[PDB]
């Protein structure tokens, strides 16, 4: 099995202990990654803080040049990297390659967005006549060392989405990949090293949560934490951050509100595409349908017809539904299915589990006493909840602890806009599925879905602070 | 009838000759304004350039205070000013008082928009690594002396819309009102004088076109020309502007496109309100209905019923339809009406003329060989043009030499947005009449409808420039 | 000696128990404020959440109108409120009236800033040709219920600095003043009630920290915490906020860096003004002089002469140096002074204490082993620390746990800009004392000085989120 | 080695019945010919642009940007080839000519990326009146239409690209009129855009005689925007013909270098000489008059003199600092300014010599305001030193110019320098540096007779865009 190494101060480093990584869909041993000690974490962080001065003092053009070179290498190696990513997290091969290509796009876009960093000149005389000769020159500065923690379900894309915005602004970065996804994260690191990223400007950390999990976050060297993952883990990291700024991209339970005047066929298409992409292992998937009763029977039938068309199988054959990330995930999903069956929900598609490969299950007549109406499955199960009023749909949508995105399906757009104002989410898509993209758009979520605003320019703003220099004109 | 004076360098001045102003609806003598000589114009401009140095170096908050005080006085005297405005341009009494109130709202909003405008700091290292220590401190500055030329149909509101944005940014201003509307303009000036506006910072010019018309525009002291009026006069001002920046607000022939799924009663209500407000003497009036044939009979009937309810009479009686601004105006409108009748259009409401009071004429089955399909009437006549496709409506709308605004009446908003993209206008209103407001929104016209972007913040941007101070950090 | 009441859902409410407040400088009984119960806290928050829907659905201009009226009432009552603020926190009478006037200025400025926070329209075709018909409409929304916690040293100004920016954006607010400072905060509340602020939109909470201290912050009704106070208290509040956003304005130890080419008399003038204002009880306040050896003797003599001339006495006599807020504060300052003397620092002005009135102490030859080099005194003591190089000055400045502001005194502005880049602070003032103002400028601290960015526009941005509505054009 | 060049018109390369032969100003070498278009051929150019506009403005920003990046890559590839001809055509040093092409590619790339992330905005009716609180305005950017871009002889490629790429990224279509002297370089630039695949009619070129098409190209109703760099008299003419169409003008300058008593004289002299004599002073942004306080004037004049004497005087191919001026009229005009200064008593610190149109660099001291050289823009290698008594006098004399492009201030007192800058009637003030257009992201603008509009990259894009507002009521 290929033995991988961490990038530490421009060098590739093994550790005494290793973690072996297996393909979720087959059990194939893919390789090993280091299990770092706390002392090895200290060395990563010390090398990053030492590199920071010379990195922040480079020009924006020079930092952008490194990012563009790294993106070119990712494009060159997209097939090579995608093939391993596909195996590591049981993502379809074509989709895995697409994740790498999208990462290159985000890196390039972040390089050009960030190099155009501008500041403000504020007039004292806007506020007080006596200060009319006093002006404030307000420029952006890096926050320092950014700890970027990527998630299993986008181990390259949602590493680069943090790395490149941080780096263009003059931050230094330590990437902690998820254990399942650490190989792909280190493959991304290879591109940044080959691009010539200066030693210590970008580093990687891998290891066991029991050894370094709290340590990497509590370390005084870290100035900013940028995390994507589960809501419980995110909340715990937040407790360890202190007053240091943190960004959290946590779970979702995005509602799809279907009104009586909606094109139910088009609604079903978008709903099924969004709900079941990557087997539903996405924070921004459609995860519950809130439908007006008078159209529920036909919407349910429309959704069912497309679910039965979803291909089910292995990542290497580019199936729509692939095996889930591990056995705990498939067990949790089966447990939600069973709770819905026990409580009287109607299964419109047939449950089948071969290993951790769960066939897509569609439930109708889901009620608010069922766990599936509320809990995020991270699996290919979709509930339908019938409502009698738009007010009821809004109330149930907002009753969720999550608030990432929502979809509204209707032909009355002025009405949809007014509904969107009332929904406790970050983004509402009209007559389409929820989605993070395009990556220039803001991406954020309310309540337990996280904290901070991403999308490219927003992520750059988040990982900078302002420095105001004030002086008096004579 | 009173004898009015120009505001020149803090003093109120008569001239040797004057212009007596009469009420278009009744012939009543309203008062007189000075007929300035070219030498007296020179004195206005020389006073303004002398005042600019001390005005531009005041704080924003000091300039805003003058503007707020002037707006307060306008509100106090809204009846006094509006009553004369009403007679001067045969605008309904209520509408004229409302014009003055709106002017105060625009002046206040401009003061607060302008006083918090900002500069920017740009990085040499965004463009060139060798320049990474070079920064540009970019601050706003006035353009200098603004010549504001207001129109007869809004002699106060479209004076204030120029004066206040100019003044908050540190420009000095000369107002040339229309001769018909010059008393109202001088009454506006009295408010700024009572507010304490420093001598020369704001001045007025009145006189005969034959004596000073070209002279005021060609004068080298003027740094910026801001004009509202007819398209032919605006074309003349362009020929005189030389290299100086100009803004022009000229004529329109705004289309109201009514699709098959429109709320025809809502459409008819908006169309009649927009078309016949101030007897059609507005650049932003609905001036042609482009309706899909399958709803045309019903839309026509709904419009006809509303047009028949409009009152026709004198400004003091707040008639919907008041007498037009002069005899040439009414002659021109009568000719358009006669051309349509003679070429076979259906007169749904009947033509009558008493003096220059023309009753509101609604034509159906208008064809594009009729002058009324294209020429801006500035009178109370509206054509209905039947089309068979949306594409034909777009083509006919865009064939016009004008391009100010358009209205689209439909329940399919994504489609309306796609239509709006193809319409050669500044603003498209969905399920509403065309309108300049709200005054924070951009107001602009394409093609022969003008040049530059107004609405408050845009007008301020247009009458400011920048000064950049570049240095190297050491 | 009045009995004050909390504003709760538009009504003035006593509590079963109350707390008597005495003037720190004289011991005069000023009045009592309610000792609220946890149930009374619940009722405040329930009132706020009930009022939120009708408040956020008002127009911006309507919310601004309430704020302008409250500011007008504060100007009207500035002498009346300032007279009591002066006694309550032992601030000079004239300085206390000035605080009230400044609060009115900040409230008016926030109203006008917040009503023109515009939104963004983002193009999908900026990122992906396939998404060129997809656009994102991004508008700001309130976060909900803001808990505002004001400090004793600006109990009106740094209450209004939170209330007004919160309210204009459509948030509802509960103000918790410090107990010493609660009368002044309730007097501010009176202005908002007289202005007609709708019931429950703005409320106050008073009581003993033992009973309600943690309770007010941990309550799930609170969506946002905005705190000014000591670093230890703010740190503890940060832990109780969980994942909810929080702004912290904490302590400082602002350095004044004085180079060999500085105007020493000018530096001394500004240093003394900034260090000893309100007896040093300010977070933004020159609290250590880092001076190059060769001009240290000269600077110290200039500073000494000014310190000797500061007036020491009672608030009602507008003394420069007034009594500290309580006995614990003066004991703490005395302990720092005694430590510096014991370790060999030169007391250039003499220590004297009567009650809690400490005379201003200037120390020279302070070293980094002395507590006074690092700990924030919140009293009238100022250390001079001699350094041999600019590099050492930067190192010592940045070694502080605090990072609020710094001053640089030098005639080499390009060099000062480069030094400013290296200082771990929010704002650097060149050739002037550190200060929060003008209030349109950003105000922020690094490290233990807090979190979040204030100044008016920044505070409004902080207490809003964005809502993105995405749709596809046809 | 002279080639017959053609205009790019609607995706095709077109000769005209008449042509204009172009000669190298430093040597007389025949370089080639460019077409002498008729008005009817201009009509065909504009008709093809307007027809191409509909499909071009509806492309995504990404798609438009890719064309620009490819064109820039091609210019970098051919920089040596293009620069070699540019050097001869406008008698610019060969190395400096190659650098101009490289800078052109940098501006094109930067404009593509600046323009593609431009945004619209949404405004609230409730900001202005309560009754309209549910009304919002969705405001998006749109091109203005057909941009006429007119480049200058002194930067025939760089200040063609500075107009073309900002215009194109925003969805405008473009017609480039190069100066006759420079038209070969302009058509060489066009070849790169053609090779990059720019759609037929989206970018086109026009060449011809002023007497035939000069006014015609500007007055034509197809043109929606005129973007011009050139002399002040020509720009005045364009303003007379623009009508109500938006214009941008980059005209002449007489930039002052204000040298205070506390100035770094060594750095001041270095920057003054580099800025004043770059490309023989044929730059709108050259240092063109030194306003120096009496106390330091003798020392500054001595050091400037020493550096002027170090400048090489010679041929473009030899990379001389001072090359021959663009034509005989230019040299005659410069000689006349020199004679007026001499006859009125100015001190010639360096010697005037003229060989053909190659004028040696002339430094004058004790220049007074009765002398033409105090005011008139030479566009040649002559620099006056004007001794002033105060900064107030330097401001007064600086602002008395009809020009108002840039200024330099040399002083160690930066807060004072900012207050001086506030009083100077110029677009940009450079502290302790020569005046200059760059960096190209910075604003570039001139007041008074120096022009109209603001360039630098993002500013030029803003100027050649308008907005479209769509207003609706939320329910």
**Domain range list for chain B:** 2-250+451-471, 254-439
Structure tokens at B342: 């003679």
Cβ neighbours of residue B224 under 8 Å, at least 6 residues apart?
A: B143, B144, B145, B146, B147, B166, B171, B244, B245, B246, B247, B463
The DSSP result for D10-33, as a single string, is TTEEE--SSEEEEE-TTT--EEEE
Block residue for tokens 């009368």: C183
Gaps in chain A with C–N over 2.5 Å, residue before each:
none
Chain D residues close to C61, C-beta within 8 Å: 126-130
Q: What is the resolution of this structure in A?
A: 1.6
| C466/A444 CB distance under 8 A | yes
The candidate with the shortest Cα–Cα distance to C160, out of C138, C131, C134, C192, is C192
Q: How many angstroms separate the CA atoms of B21 and B30, rounded?
A: 6
Residue D193, H or E segment = helix D183-195
For residue A417, give how far its alpha carbon lies from the nearest alpha carbon of chain C (Å): 8
For residue A165, give how far its alpha carbon lies from the nearest alpha carbon of chain B (Å): 15
Contact predicate B368/B385, CB 8 Å: yes
Cβ neighbours of residue C259 under 8 Å, at least 6 residues apart?
A: C292, C390, C408, C409, C410, C412, C415
Q: How many angstroms separate the CA atoms of C303 and C293, rounded?
A: 15
Interface with chain B: mutation pick from C71, C410, C417, C437, highest number of B CBs within 10 Å: C417
Q: How many angstroms separate the CA atoms of C89 and C109, rounded?
A: 26
Q: How many angstroms separate the CA atoms of A167 and C431, rounded?
A: 34
Contact predicate D310/D278, CB 8 Å: no
Contact predicate D359/D381, CB 8 Å: yes
The candidate with the shortest Cα–Cα distance to D339, out of D329, D352, D325, is D352
Residue B430, H or E segment = strand B427-430
β-partners of residue B354 are B357
Give ∠ CA D8-D11-D13 in degrees, rounded to 5: 40
Contact predicate C396/C257, CB 8 Å: no
The DSSP result for C329-386, as a single string, is HHHHHHHHHHHHHHTT-EESS---EETTEEPPEEEES--TTSGGGTS---SSEEEEEE
The DSSP result for A130-153, as a single string, is GGTTEEEEEEEEE-SEEEEE--TT
Class of domain B254-439: alpha beta
Tell me the count of B-D CB pairs closer than 8 A.
158
| CATH code that applies to domain C254-441 | 3.40.309.10
Contact predicate A216/A222, CB 8 Å: yes
- CB proximity B261 to A under 8 Å: no
Task: Look at the alpha carbons of C6, C10, C12, C14 in this order and tell me if their dihedral is positive or negative.
Answer: negative
Q: In B, residues 123-162, which contact A (CB 8 Å cutoff)?
A: 123, 125-129, 131-132, 135, 137-139
> Backbone phi, then psi, for C473, in 5-degree steps?
-75, 140
Q: How many angstroms separate the CA atoms of D122 and D467, rounded?
A: 12
The candidate with the shortest Cα–Cα distance to D62, out of C125, A113, A116, C136, is C125
Cβ neighbours of residue C329 under 8 Å, at least 6 residues apart?
A: C281, C356, C378, C379
Contact predicate A104/A71, CB 8 Å: yes
DSSP D322: B
Residue D385, H or E segment = strand D382-388
The DSSP result for C119-175, as a single string, is EEEEEGGGT-GGGTTEEEEEEEEE-SEEEEE--TTSTTHHHHHHHHHHHHTT-EEEE
The candidate with the shortest Cα–Cα distance to D472, out of B442, B413, B287, is B413
Nearest to C122 among A109, A245, A440 (CB): A440
Q: Which chain C residue has the Cα nearest residue B108?
A: C112
Residue D304, H or E segment = helix D294-308
Residue C185, H or E segment = helix C182-194
Contact predicate B432/B445, CB 8 Å: no
The candidate with the shortest Cα–Cα distance to C253, out of C372, C376, C384, is C376
Interface with chain B: mutation pick from A111, A123, A408, highest number of B CBs within 10 Å: A123
Q: How far apart are the first and last CA of chain C?
A: 70
The candidate with the shortest Cα–Cα distance to D124, out of C58, B244, B251, A8, is C58
Nearest to C118 among D63, D122, D132 (CB): D122
The candidate with the shortest Cα–Cα distance to A164, out of A123, A126, A107, is A107
Class of domain B2-250+451-471: alpha beta
Cβ neighbours of residue B92 under 8 Å, at least 6 residues apart?
A: B86, B278, B315, B317, B318, B319, B320, B322
Please give the sequence-ordered ranges of beta strands (E in DSSP) within D15-159, or none if there are none: 19-23, 30-35, 120-124, 135-143, 146-150
Helix (H/G/I), strand (E/B), else coil: B413 = helix
Contact predicate B253/B400, CB 8 Å: yes
For residue B394, give how far its alpha carbon lies from the nearest alpha carbon of chain C (Å): 15
Q: How many angstroms separate the CA atoms of C468 and C448, rounded?
A: 34
Burial track D17-42 (b if 16+ CB lie within 10 A, e otherwise): eebbebbbbbeeeebbbbbbbbeebb
**Which is it for strands C29-35 and C2-3: parallel, antiparallel or unpaired?**
parallel
Helix (H/G/I), strand (E/B), else coil: A187 = helix
Give the gyration radius of chain A's Cα atoms: 23
Q: How many angstroms separate the CA atoms of A55 and A57, rounded?
A: 5
Q: How many angstroms separate the CA atoms of C444 and C449, rounded?
A: 8
| CATH code that applies to domain D3-251+452-471 | 3.40.605.10
Q: What's the CATH superfamily of C2-250+450-470?
A: Aldehyde Dehydrogenase; Chain A, domain 1 (3.40.605.10)
Structure tokens at C441: 């400028």
Burial track A217-239 (b if 16+ CB lie within 10 A, e otherwise): bebebbbbbbbbbbbebbeebbe
Structure tokens at A397: 């949508």
Q: How many angstroms separate the CA atoms of D316 and A10, rounded?
A: 47
Q: How many angstroms separate the CA atoms of B284 and B249, rounded?
A: 10
Structure tokens at A466: 């302002």
The candidate with the shortest Cα–Cα distance to D430, out of D403, D409, D401, is D409
Interface with chain C: mutation pick from A438, A450, A472, highest number of C CBs within 10 Å: A438
The candidate with the shortest Cα–Cα distance to A202, out of A85, A369, A70, is A70
Structure tokens at B166: 């100019």
Structure tokens at C429: 């003032």
Q: Which CATH architecture has domain A6-250+451-471?
A: 3-Layer(aba) Sandwich (3.40)
Contact predicate A19/A33, CB 8 Å: yes
Among the four given CATH numbers 3.60.21.70, 3.40.309.10, 3.40.50.1460, 3.20.20.70, the one describing domain A254-442: 3.40.309.10
Cβ neighbours of residue A214 under 8 Å, at least 6 residues apart?
A: A240
Structure tokens at D146: 């057909």
β-partners of residue B439 are none
CA separation (Å) from A394 to A222, A388, A389, A425, C280?
40, 11, 9, 11, 53
DSSP B321: B
| B418/C471 CB distance under 8 A | no
Count the residues in chain A.
474
Q: Residue B164 class from Cβ within 10 Å (0-12 exposed, 13-18 middle, 19+ buried)?
A: buried
Q: How many angstroms separate the CA atoms of C398 and C390, rounded?
A: 12
Contact predicate A150/A159, CB 8 Å: yes
| C138/D122 CB distance under 8 A | yes
CATH topology of domain D255-440: Aldehyde Dehydrogenase; Chain A, domain 2 (3.40.309)
Q: Residue B129 class from Cβ within 10 Å (0-12 exposed, 13-18 middle, 19+ buried)?
A: middle
CA dihedral B310→B315→B317→B318, nearest 10 degrees, is 50
Give ∠ CA A101-A104-A109 in degrees, rounded to 5: 130
Q: How many angstroms separate the CA atoms of D464 and D454, rounded?
A: 11
Return the number of other C-beta atoms located less than 10 Å from residue A54's C-beta.
12
DSSP B219: -
| C137/D138 CB distance under 8 A | yes
Q: How many angstroms separate the CA atoms of D98 and C206, rounded?
A: 74
Q: How many angstroms separate the CA atoms of C201 and C193, rounded?
A: 10
Block residue for tokens 């110029």: D426
Contact predicate A474/D416, CB 8 Å: yes
Structure tokens at B29: 């003598």
- CB proximity B59 to A under 8 Å: yes
**Helix/strand/coil percentages in chain C, nearest 5:** 45, 25, 35
Residue B286, H or E segment = strand B286-292
Chain C residues close to D140, C-beta within 8 Å: 121, 123, 135
Structure tokens at A71: 């993106």
Cβ neighbours of residue B2 under 8 Å, at least 6 residues apart?
A: B31, B32
Q: Which chain A residue has the Cα nearest residue D420?
A: A474
Contact predicate C426/C403, CB 8 Å: yes
Contact predicate D292/D388, CB 8 Å: yes
């Amino acid at each position: 099995a290929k033995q991988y190494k961490n990038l530490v101060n421009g060098e590739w480093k093994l550790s005494e202990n290793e973690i072996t990584i297996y393909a979720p869909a087959t059990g194939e041993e893919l390789g090993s990654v280091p299990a770092m000690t706390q002392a090895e974490v200290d060395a990563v962080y010390a090398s990053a803080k030492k590199a920071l001065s010379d990195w922040r003092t480079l020009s924006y053009v020079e930092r952008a040049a490194y990012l563009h070179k790294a993106a070119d290498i990712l494009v060159r190696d997209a097939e090579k990297i995608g093939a391993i990513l596909s195996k590591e997290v049981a993502k379809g091969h074509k989709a895995a390659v697409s994740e790498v290509i999208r990462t290159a796009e985000i890196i390039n876009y972040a390089a050009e967005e960030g190099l155009r960093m501008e500041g403000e000149v504020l007039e004292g005389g806007s506020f007080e006549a006596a200060s009319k000769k006093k002006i404030a020159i307000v420029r952006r500065e890096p926050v320092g060392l950014v700890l970027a923690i990527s998630p299993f379900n986008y181990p390259v894309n949602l590493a680069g989405s943090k790395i490149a915005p941080a780096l263009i602004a003059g931050n230094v970065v330590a990437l902690k990949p998820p254990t399942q996804g650490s190989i792909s994260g280190l493959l991304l690191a290879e591109a940044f090293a080959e691009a010539g990223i200066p030693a210590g400007v970008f580093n990687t950390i891998t290891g066991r949560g029991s050894v370094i999990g709290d340590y990497i976050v509590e370390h005084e060297a870290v100035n900013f934490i940028n995390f994507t993952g589960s809501t419980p883990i995110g909340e715990g990291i937040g407790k360890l951050a202190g007053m240091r700024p943190i960004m959290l991209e946590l779970g979702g339970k995005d509602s799809a509100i279907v009104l009586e005047d909606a094109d139910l066929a088009l609604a079903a298409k978008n709903i099924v595409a969004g709900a079941f992409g990557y087997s539903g292992q996405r924070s921004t998937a459609v995860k519950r349908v809130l439908v007006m009763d008078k159209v529920a029977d036909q919407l349910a039938a429309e959704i069912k017809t497309l679910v039965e068309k979803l291909s089910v199988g292995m990542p290497e054959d580019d199936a729509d539904i692939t095996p889930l990330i591990d056995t705990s995930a498939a067990d949790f999903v089966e447990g939600l299915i069973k709770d819905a069956t026990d409580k009287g929900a109607t299964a419109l598609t047939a449950f089948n589990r071969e290993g951790n490969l769960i066939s897509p299950v569609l439930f109708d007549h889901v009620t608010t006493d069922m766990r599936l109406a509320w809990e995020e499955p991270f699996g290919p199960v979709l509930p339908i909840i019938r409502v009698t009023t738009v007010e009821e749909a809004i109330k149930i949508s907002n009753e969720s602890e999550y608030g990432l995105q929502a979809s509204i399906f209707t032909t009355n757009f002025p009405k949809a806009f007014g509904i969107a104002e009332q929904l406790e989410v970050g983004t509402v898509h009209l007559n389409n599925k929820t989605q993070r993209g395009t990556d220039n758009f803001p991406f954020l979520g309310a309540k337990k879905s996280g904290a901070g605003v991403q999308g490219v320019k927003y992520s750059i703003e988040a990982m900078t602070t302002v420095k105001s220099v004030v002086f008096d004109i004579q």
